[PDB]
UniProtKB/Swiss-Prot annotation:
Substrate binds at residues 32, 115, 128, 143. The keyword S-adenosyl-L-methionine does not apply. This is Endolysin. Its main location: host cell. It is found in: Host cytoplasm. It comes from Enterobacteria phage T4 (Bacteriophage T4). Changing residue 11 to Q: Complete loss of activity.
Length: 175
């Protein structure tokens, strides 16, 4: 197991644009494109938002994709996105010290969170980050669960939290 295999499990692989639970048009392995409108929001708005997502996809791929990509293309966006997530952690004054303090498995758990919620979002878990830096694993696990993050994607959150708790890949075995 490594960060790529871990995120591949949590994000899945879809070759056509889809909407994730947070209302974002997404494709590949968790590659976010743009935000979608309301289930109501006009018949027009809907189509505009769809083309806006396709526009973002084409720009990212450098081709006229019409919302469909190949596995190789999804993996290319994925490599870029993982690198970007790590790069962001390293450039963030709050995340870097925690990241540097962690072992390799726990570092993957933090990259996973950043990949899902973005750098500023994770930098906001001030109390959990402190508990992680103090190696207070169980307390960090309890604090991390008291979040919209956990309530919205509990099964994934539980795997990430278990990884921080144990420092092992147990939550991802048989997956």
């Amino acid at each position: 197991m490594n960060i790529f295999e871990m995120l591949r499990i949590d994000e899945g692989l879809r070759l056509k644009i889809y909407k994730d639970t947070e209302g974002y048009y997404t494709i590949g392995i968790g590659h976010l494109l743009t935000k979608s409108p309301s289930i109501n929001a006009a018949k027009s708005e809907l189509d505009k938002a769809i083309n806006a997502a396709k526009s973002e996809l084409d720009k990212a791929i450098g081709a006229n994709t019409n919302g469909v990509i190949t596995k190789d293309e999804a993996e290319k966006l994925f490599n870029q996105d993982v690198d970007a997530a790590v790069r962001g952690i390293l450039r963030n004054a709050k995340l870097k010290p925690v990241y540097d303090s962690l072992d390799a498995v726990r570092r993957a758990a933090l990259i996973n969170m950043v990949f899902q919620m973005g750098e500023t979002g994770v930098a906001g878990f001030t109390n959990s980050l402190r508990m992680l830096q103090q190696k207070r694993w169980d307390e960090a696990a309890v604090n991390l669960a008291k979040s919209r993050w956990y309530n919205q994607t509990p099964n994934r959150a539980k795997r990430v939290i278990t990884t921080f708790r144990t420092g092992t890949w147990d939550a991802y075995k048989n997956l």
